[PDB]
From a paper:
CCs are quaternary structures comprising two or more α-helices supercoiled around each other with cyclic (Cn) or dihedral (Dn) symmetry. Here, we describe variants with all combinations of the aliphatic residues, Ile, Leu and Val, at a and d to give four classes of peptide: the ββ class, with a and d = Ile or Val; Lβ, a = Leu and d = Ile or Val; βL, a = Ile or Val and d = Leu; and LL, a = d = Leu. Peptides are named systematically appending the one-letter code for the amino acids at the a and d sites to “CC-Type2-“; e.g., CC-Hept becomes CC-Type2-LI. In summary, solution-phase data and X-ray crystal structures demonstrate conclusively that different classes of Type-2 coiled-coil (CC) peptides—i.e., based on abcdefg repeats with predominantly hydrophobic residues at a, d, e and g—adopt a range of distinct states.
Numbering used by the authors:
A (entry chain F), B (entry chain E), C (entry chain D), D (entry chain C), E (entry chain B), F (entry chain A), ...: 1 to 30
The structure:
């Protein structure tokens, strides 16, 4: 369904946020 | 539908957050 | 509709978050 | 409606997050 | 209603995130 | 209800985010 | 249900965000 799929798109965008925060962690490590 | 499209706007806004966190990572790296 | 408009308000608020993160990045640059 | 008003409460809480991240930016600049 | 009440719980949890970011701001000031 | 319970799981996960941001604040404090 | 399951996917992605913030804290601790 379109609403469920749009909620999956939200979930995928929150995973992108997580990956961006991992880039911040890598920056402070290096 | 209107609700599904509004949820997709939420997803797009979260991608903007993800990009801004990549900007923070780049700023820490110099 | 009122639910779709409220979800658009959420999307606008998450763009405010993104912009605040960009301000953090510009603070770390300088 | 109750669901729309609750979604508005979520939007207002996301604006509070934005304002807090602005505080972080000011703290890094000070 | 239960859906509206659960959306209010999400808003309460977002305010906790805002508080935690004020803690990070305070930690950088010191 | 299953939708309300899933929204409560989102709220709990946002609390987890808040706790993790306090860990960042503690790290800056040390 | 599909919508409940998509909301659970959002909750899972927010826990990934929390983990990445723990990684940021760990990188600031050395």
């Amino acid at each position: 369904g379109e609403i469920a799929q749009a909620x999956k798109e939200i979930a995928k965008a929150x995973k992108e946020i997580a990956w961006a925060x991992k880039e911040i962690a890598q920056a402070x490590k290096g």
